[PDB]
């Protein structure tokens, strides 16, 4: 930012001294002094001081940061002619583009490769499909085939994306933030193969960077996946290692992300043509790059002529080959959500918290919709200027993603109260329905639901019938329904309406009617209003499957428990048992069962009998990243308890820690005992 000289920022781990030698030759020929600095955290200092017109004339950094600098207008558009652009590998120019315009010069290229132990594995595998058999071979020799960091998506992405996956679609020099390839058939096939490697004991789901590096550099595993930064540590080991092309999957190359060390020009620089001359004519030449490479190695470089020299090192050649088959890392701000969404998906799928399809689906959603704490924070700040309809829209969308940001939902409630004067019923109802879906109770709880009752009392009968059900049901979820609202939906007219339907929509409306009716029966003791007539109350997951098989083994006989028990309240129990006072199973269906629509037995349960319900909770039954159930299932559990059941909760994350059948039986028996003991303590 000073005329007549050039100031260059570059990270401290690069060959800034070799870069200075280029500056000295530049001064010698042009008379322009060139100064090179390596300030700490320059990738964060640069947007600070360039926003106000200060900083260096040229900055060196990985290309992904430059996309954000350009958005702020901090990087000048560069003007290399086609003659110069032909000197560099074409794909590298695709990394220094913003809104179709070049904003930096490619310098060096970096990507993951396959690193292998030539003593354990003289010829590395060409394909991913061979590795399992190879691991069986090596496990018998006291070794393993492959170990790499499974915790961070940067290392797993080469396999996930091999057969068609991609972060954001790139076309005509631009990224399409709406076109996300996290959940297509290629991403699924790759992740499935990764998960299968784990299930088959060829890889461990806990393996991270440190574990894999130690294993390979100690000679314990025949292969790893890593980058040039890791070569020094292997040189200091005793492993005769090679570096080569990543294996194919479905005959498609592995697609690692590519990092392009680039040089940008400060938009606030008065020496843009001097910076252009130094970069194009002195740095990006065989002599210039050699000078920098002599100080600290660049790895593979974008300049074709010098890459031919460096590529004599077969490790550099493999780096460039993998980069040319890889996916340039998108330089757009939308990648932040990608990293978080995909990281969660891989961990969830590899550990069994989700299937491959479920995990990638959510990562897709998370990447397309850019959900992040910054999103909720941005909305929280707009709240005073948002309309009632915009809040209703917000609430609906967050509830749909099961994303319960307590600070934002409390601001929804306050927003509604501050506009109780003119807020329309639809806008109020959208918030109510969102609160119920996520089981959110605001701090000004009495005030919020007083408004709901007030606004809804006079207009409820005139609403569409299915909507009346949706709204009363939401109040039942939140324990706010009033007898007059229950009555409005439970009087003998409303039923015949939805009762006789095949739509699956009337059937859902009716199911919610059973929940309302169940609330009146079980949670309002003084309720003397109308109820549904007794005559009108009459796909399998792995968790559901294993829970049933484990329970069948414990019970021993079919008569000591009932599986998939449909109640007259709409809810279905995974299982029910009747324990006598000694904790031994009784023949449950020999006894009366008020919770059921049909009577199934005449005998009265012995005194001291304890009726237990096993209730399974699946991953989607919870708010995102929490152990709090959605409203629908808070309501279900509240009803089963009110029906006189002791609860054995079987959430997926508890069952997931039980790796053997013995553990699963022991866990269920413990939960039964604990529930019964919890009760006896209640009665004191
Ligand atoms: O080279 C930058 C980074 O590359 C990747 C590695 O996980 C990290 O250890 C290294 O520092
Ligand atoms: O954290 C509260 C509860 O979370 C869930 C678990 O089923 C339960 O065991 C635990 O007490
Ligand atoms: O290539 C640069 C990238 O490499 C990583 O270390 C991989 O974990 C990232 O943290 C960084 O952004
Ligand atoms: O979200 C709260 C709910 O979470 C559970 O622990 C899940 O098993 C229930 O016991 C509890 O009521």
Author numbering: -58 to 479, 488 to 633
What does the paper say about this structure?
Members of the FASTK families share the RNA-binding domains FAST1, FAST2 and RAP, the latter of which is known for its nuclear and chloroplast nuclease activity for RNA splicing and processing. Our biochemical studies show that FASTKD4 binds the canonical poly(A) tail of MT-ND3 enabling its maturation and translation.
The atomic structure of FASTKD4 from residues 309–631, that includes the two FAST and RAP domains, was determined at 2.15 Å resolution. The FAST1 domain is composed of three alpha helices, whereas the FAST2 and RAP domains are composed of two alpha helices spanned by two beta sheets and loops. The FAST2 domain separates the RAP domain from the FAST1 domain, creating a positively charged cavity that could potentially bind negatively charged RNA. This cavity shares striking similarity to the structures of the very short patch repair (Vsr) and I-Bth0305I bacterial endonucleases, where the Asn in position 570 is juxtaposed to Asp 523 in FASTKD4, compared to the conserved pairing of His 69 to Asp 51 in the active site of Vsr. Another apparent structural feature is the central helix (Q445-E464), that we have referred to as a ‘Lock’, flanked by two unidentified loops without sufficient electron density. The full-length protein could not be produced effectively as it resulted in aggregation and based on our structure, we speculate that it may be possible for the ‘Lock’ helix to be displaced by insertion of the ‘Key’ helix (E610-L632) to promote tandem oligomerization. We conclude that L463 and residues 616–618 are required for the stability of FASTKD4, whereas the positively charged residues 620, 622 and 623, and therefore the Key helix interactions, are important for its activity.
